[PDB]
Nucleic acid binder design. Structure first.
Lengths: 77, 102, 35, 46, 50
RNA sequence: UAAGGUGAUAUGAACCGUUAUAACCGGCGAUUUCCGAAUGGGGAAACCCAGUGUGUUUCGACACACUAUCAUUAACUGAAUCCAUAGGUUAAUGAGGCGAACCGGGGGAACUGAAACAUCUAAGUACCCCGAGGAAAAGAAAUCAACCGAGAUUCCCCCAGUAGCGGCGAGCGAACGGGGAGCAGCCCAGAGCCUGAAUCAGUGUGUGUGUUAGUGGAAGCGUCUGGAAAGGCGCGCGAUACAGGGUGACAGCCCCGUACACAAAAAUGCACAUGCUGUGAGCUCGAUGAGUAGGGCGGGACACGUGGUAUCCUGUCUGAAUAUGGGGGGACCAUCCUCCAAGGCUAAAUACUCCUGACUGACCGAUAGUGAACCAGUACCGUGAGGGAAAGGCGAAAAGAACCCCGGCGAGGGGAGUGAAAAAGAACCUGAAACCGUGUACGUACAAGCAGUGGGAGCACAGUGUGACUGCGUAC
């Protein structure tokens, strides 16, 4: 399902509002891509369907620090 | 704790035999009590080919209510009520009005 | 001697009231010309 | 002529049978609604 | 309060208020109180104590 | 705890027990087929087919046990590939399923209202899903207030149908402040001295107290009617008990109870006392939660529909300061008040009732009250989801009609009998009306129509019934 593996961004729902304010239901899907991140600890590549907000969490916090927050959470990678 | 038991010479307080004295034959389940020679009815007993093929108008005794009898005291001469005391670790039926054990 | 049976109605109409009333499917009366 | 009900136990038990009802979420809700009603026969089965 | 003041005013009119100074009974026994109002000449009564 | 029992329709039959295990009631224990999460694989539930152990074997076999998947962890051995992973196996743990409502979260209508309708409404409702607990959630100020101050959340009453929002329409609708219910605050981002230092848990004896069987209970007789007395009349007695029920009619005193006084092998709820184990105090200091706050865009939530509009949430794109700093105070700014976000836990007041116990009712009384007073979610109906009835009363007690007649060894009936009553006979209390008969009185076979009404003979009864002829007269 369209969930970021680092930030946990679900698709959220909301409205389309026209210029005549007609509300109709839509979904704000997260900007998800599967990307392979190089870890020098594990000496491998690891792929993660991550949002583009999550790609910024990874290089700001570290890729070891992000994965440590996934094994201690319950995600599988 | 029954106040009216298997073989007690009782007296009837109510209902067409008011005053008559007989002995209990068997206490049934539903508060009905057979008294000997007291509550006589007239059963038109149908003869079946076996099993008491005498099929007369059999006169048996019907069940009377257990509250309509009282135990005959006979040491006062009157009907009398029952209480329950403990003598010698046994629950003891005793008469009212003279407190003495049955 | 197991007598005084009832009047078992049809198992079609669940409102025994109209069980013997109308079939309750199609009402075909066809000759109506009003213009 | 040919009426709508042509019985077959195999087509019955594969459509409305207990294992067919217990296969999906919406059939276990059927069986939940028929225990909650108090139904004698739960499915078409026996 | 205007009703109760008007009922108590009427109970002294139809002489159904009797004020005692003490109404007490020694043993907590219904037999004694059953006697309590025979001398008082009461059968249907409401006792109101403080 | 007992003198009676072997559940009910349900009689028997064969028995068991009688003051010490007959049954009954309770606590604990054993047994607990098959299906169903169903778990050894399968399957059209209630069936089919095994695997591997372990026995035992008359050699035909027979038993008992194991064998699900997933999650976490550990052990071993293990590719492409050398390390190493992935994988594979074997263990231990734990999970799943069902459940009426309440609860939190994720999704989310339309009819309707607007007198049409699209913004708005209905309504974040119905529903669907996920998850939890006895409650849940929220919760210890980035809060309000207004220059005074308040001091976590929740709930209730006001504030107030106010301020506002709003095709400024329909409608929506607060806070501040005040009165109450209940009221506890604490941790981690951290190292020292001290060093079980109270805590808060679990487990176990111990006490106090319920729950789960129970025990004792207090007293009335004559008399008349009657089928029968509980009624009437007479005269007593109990009452911390005159709540209720039953008994042949209406019982304080007949029974069961009730008030009251009591009781527990054993297993449990609650407190307390705690011993023993786990967490872990107090003091010195530092530390003070970043892809966050904020912003641009799009939405949503706030009573608040983007409007001048704060605040919150965040899909997307960005991006601080780091206490000498930061948030808020309804656009925004300056003052100066107040607070310290980006970690978490937290009882009570609150909501609910599938279920158990009592208790109550200006609640129902069999077309009512549950759909269901009764073998009712049944009979029936539908492929199915699903729908879904009707049906209570003999009598005080079966004493439920022996026997005799007619009949077809019928059905039904007439006697006889029971009983107060059979016009209580089971198609059974009471038995209305429609509707259908029989008997009797009167009328009626030359008379036209809302059928009555006014007049009215005659006749039949003991005033009633009928009503010839006649005037007027087209139901609701």
């Amino acid at each position: 399902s369209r969930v970021c593996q680092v930030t946990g961004k679900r698709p959220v729902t909301g409205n389309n509002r026209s210029h005549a304010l007609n509300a109709t239901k839509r979904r704000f899907l997260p900007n998800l891509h599967s990307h392979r991140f190089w870890v020098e600890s594990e000496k491998r590549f690891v792929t993660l369907r991550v949002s583009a907000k999550g790609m910024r969490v990874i290089d700001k916090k570290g890729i070891d620090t992000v994965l440590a927050e996934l094994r201690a959470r319950g995600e599988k990678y | 704790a029954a106040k009216i038991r298997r073989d007690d010479e009782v007296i009837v307080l109510t209902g067409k035999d008011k005053g008559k004295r007989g002995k209990v034959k068997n206490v049934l389940s539903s508060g009905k009590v057979i008294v000997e020679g007291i509550n006589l009815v007239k059963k038109h007993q149908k003869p079946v080919p076996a099993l008491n093929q005498p099929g007369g108008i059999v006169e048996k005794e019907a069940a009377i209510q257990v509250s309509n009898v009282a135990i005959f005291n006979a040491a006062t001469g009157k009907a009398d009520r029952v209480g329950f005391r403990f003598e010698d670790g046994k629950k003891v039926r005793f008469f009212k009005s003279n407190s003495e054990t049955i | 001697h197991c007598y005084e049976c009832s009047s078992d109605c049809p198992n079609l109409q669940p409102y025994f009231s109209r069980c013997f009333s109308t079939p309750v499917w199609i009402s075909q009366a066809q000759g109506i010309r009003a213009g | 002529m040919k009426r709508t009900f042509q019985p077959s136990v195999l087509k019955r038990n594969r459509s409305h049978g207990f294992r067919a009802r217990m296969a999906t979420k919406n059939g276990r809700q059927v069986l939940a609604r028929r225990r909650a009603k108090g139904r004698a026969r739960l499915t078409v089965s026996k | 309060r205007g009703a109760l003041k008007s009922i108590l005013s009427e109970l002294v009119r139809q002489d159904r208020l009797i004020v005692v100074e003490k109404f007490s009974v020694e043993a907590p026994k219904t037999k004694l109180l059953a006697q309590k109002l025979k001398d008082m000449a009461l059968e249907d009564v409401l006792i109101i104590t403080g």
